[PDB]
Motif scaffolding. Structure first.
Motif, mmCIF file in Angstrom:
data_model
loop_
_atom_site.group_PDB
_atom_site.id
_atom_site.type_symbol
_atom_site.label_atom_id
_atom_site.label_comp_id
_atom_site.label_asym_id
_atom_site.label_seq_id
_atom_site.Cartn_x
_atom_site.Cartn_y
_atom_site.Cartn_z
ATOM 1 N N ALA A 1 0.775 -1.245 0.000
ATOM 2 C CA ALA A 1 0.000 0.000 0.000
ATOM 3 C C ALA A 1 0.813 1.306 0.000
ATOM 4 O O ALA A 1 0.569 2.219 -0.811
ATOM 5 C CB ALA A 1 -0.977 -0.003 1.170
ATOM 6 N N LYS A 2 1.762 1.385 0.928
ATOM 7 C CA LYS A 2 2.633 2.534 1.124
ATOM 8 C C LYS A 2 3.168 3.125 -0.171
ATOM 9 O O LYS A 2 3.408 4.324 -0.255
ATOM 10 C CB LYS A 2 3.791 2.105 2.008
ATOM 11 C CG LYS A 2 4.487 3.205 2.727
ATOM 12 C CD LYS A 2 3.737 3.589 3.974
ATOM 13 C CE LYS A 2 4.698 4.206 4.998
ATOM 14 N NZ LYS A 2 5.421 5.380 4.417
ATOM 15 N N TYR A 3 3.407 2.287 -1.174
ATOM 16 C CA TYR A 3 3.908 2.767 -2.462
ATOM 17 C C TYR A 3 2.902 3.733 -3.074
ATOM 18 O O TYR A 3 1.715 3.732 -2.699
ATOM 19 C CB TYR A 3 4.174 1.590 -3.408
ATOM 20 C CG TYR A 3 5.255 0.679 -2.897
ATOM 21 C CD1 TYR A 3 6.541 1.167 -2.651
ATOM 22 C CD2 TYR A 3 4.989 -0.661 -2.586
ATOM 23 C CE1 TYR A 3 7.533 0.348 -2.103
ATOM 24 C CE2 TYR A 3 5.986 -1.484 -2.030
ATOM 25 C CZ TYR A 3 7.244 -0.960 -1.797
ATOM 26 O OH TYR A 3 8.220 -1.730 -1.240
ATOM 27 N N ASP A 4 3.363 4.549 -4.021
ATOM 28 C CA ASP A 4 2.507 5.555 -4.648
ATOM 29 C C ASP A 4 1.816 5.059 -5.897
ATOM 30 O O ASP A 4 0.840 5.641 -6.349
ATOM 31 C CB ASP A 4 3.283 6.850 -4.933
ATOM 32 C CG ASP A 4 4.418 6.651 -5.907
ATOM 33 O OD1 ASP A 4 4.620 5.511 -6.392
ATOM 34 O OD2 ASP A 4 5.126 7.638 -6.193
ATOM 35 N N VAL B 1 0.434 2.279 -5.910
ATOM 36 C CA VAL B 1 -0.586 1.408 -5.329
ATOM 37 C C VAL B 1 -1.590 2.191 -4.468
ATOM 38 O O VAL B 1 -1.205 3.067 -3.656
ATOM 39 C CB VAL B 1 0.079 0.295 -4.448
ATOM 40 C CG1 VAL B 1 -0.966 -0.627 -3.845
ATOM 41 C CG2 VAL B 1 1.024 -0.520 -5.255
ATOM 42 N N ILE B 2 -2.868 1.842 -4.632
ATOM 43 C CA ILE B 2 -3.989 2.439 -3.899
ATOM 44 C C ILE B 2 -4.096 1.835 -2.477
ATOM 45 O O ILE B 2 -4.218 0.611 -2.324
ATOM 46 C CB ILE B 2 -5.334 2.182 -4.676
ATOM 47 C CG1 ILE B 2 -5.234 2.702 -6.115
ATOM 48 C CG2 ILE B 2 -6.509 2.820 -3.977
ATOM 49 C CD1 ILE B 2 -6.515 2.489 -6.963
ATOM 50 N N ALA B 3 -4.026 2.675 -1.443
ATOM 51 C CA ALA B 3 -4.149 2.203 -0.062
ATOM 52 C C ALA B 3 -5.594 2.385 0.387
ATOM 53 O O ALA B 3 -6.085 3.510 0.526
ATOM 54 C CB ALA B 3 -3.214 2.961 0.864
HETATM 55 NA NA NA Z 1 -0.007 3.533 -2.029
#
Ligand code: NA
Ligand code: NA
Length: 274
Positions: free
Chosen positions: A168-171, A173-175
């Motif tokens: 999730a933390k990645y940008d 990827v949608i959290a």
């Molecule tokens: Na993310």
């Protein structure tokens, strides 16, 4: 006959299914503990297992079948109804029956989805740390036009502390966070500068191993609601790049409060697929 879990109308998904948008022909991979393919209310079209000793079409844990259920349980007169009932479902087992799996097993999972043409990739998994490869693995799935949706985390709010987890933390990827049926944020939902949207997570009823249905809690339940919403949007406007889809989910979101606890707010597939 068929139960319609609270989340379906909560995110206006039922309005979209009305117009005739059910996500037909959209390829979605569920990167989880596998999927009980034989469940009558589910239809796995294919996939792969990167876990030793077990095929992708069997779920030794229950998690994967519950999540896959929220995305596309058959719009029939038995069991439940999923967000995108006509989606081509793909079981990508990257987590063992204990709900745990390696960075590599997961990266391979993501690698397969992109190479095999999934338009949406759902990851209701995660942990305190990431990986250089995992980071790369998601940025490419995304650059390659897939919609990468992940679960934010069930780490509560530790004050001003970022409890959002990887992937999730990645940008790229949608959290996704979690709300109850009241639209209030659930206590376990992770808080962080990356929390992107909120979807149903508390008391989510769905398909469950050995042809039955259960109620579970967790951002893991919230996640397959947006992956399901991405599917409907894409079925409505096919030639919509991942970014446009990502934008319309967040942009049109129903504000509930502070973005550190909610992100852009609750989703609204109806406003998004407009
Ligand atoms: Na993310
Ligand atoms: Na059903």
């Amino acid at each position: 006959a068929q139960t319609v879990p609270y989340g379906i109308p909560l995110i206006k998904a039922d309005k979209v299914q009305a117009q005739g948008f059910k996500g037909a022909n959209v390829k979605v991979a569920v990167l989880d503990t596998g999927i009980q393919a034989s469940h009558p209310d589910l239809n796995v079209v294919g996939g792969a297992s990167f876990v030793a000793g077990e095929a992708y079409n069997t779920d030794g844990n229950g998690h994967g079948t519950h999540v896959a259920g929220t995305v596309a349980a058959l719009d029939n007169t038995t069991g439940v109804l999923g967000v995108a009932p006509s989606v081509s479902l793909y079981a990508v087992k990257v987590l063992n029956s204990s709900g745990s799996g390696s960075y590599s097993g997961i990266v391979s999972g993501i690698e397969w989805a992109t190479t095999n043409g999934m338009d949406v990739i759902n990851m209701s998994l995660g942990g305190a740390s990431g990986s250089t490869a995992m980071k790369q693995a998601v940025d490419n799935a995304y650059a390659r036009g897939v919609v990468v949706v992940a679960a934010a985390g069930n780490s509560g709010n530790s004050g001003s502390t970022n409890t959002i987890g990887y992937p999730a933390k990645y940008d790229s990827v949608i959290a996704v966070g979690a709300v109850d049926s009241n639209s209030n944020r659930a206590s376990f939902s992770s808080v962080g500068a990356e929390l992107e949207v909120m979807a149903p997570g508390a008391g989510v009823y769905s398909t469950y191993p050995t042809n039955t249905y259960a109620t579970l809690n967790g951002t893991x339940m919230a996640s397959p609601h947006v992956a399901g919403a991405a599917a409907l949007i894409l079925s409505k406007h096919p030639n919509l790049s991942a970014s446009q889809v990502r934008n319309r989910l967040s942009s049109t979101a129903t504000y509930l409060g502070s973005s550190f606890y909610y992100g852009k707010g609750l989703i609204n597939v109806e406003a998004a697929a407009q």
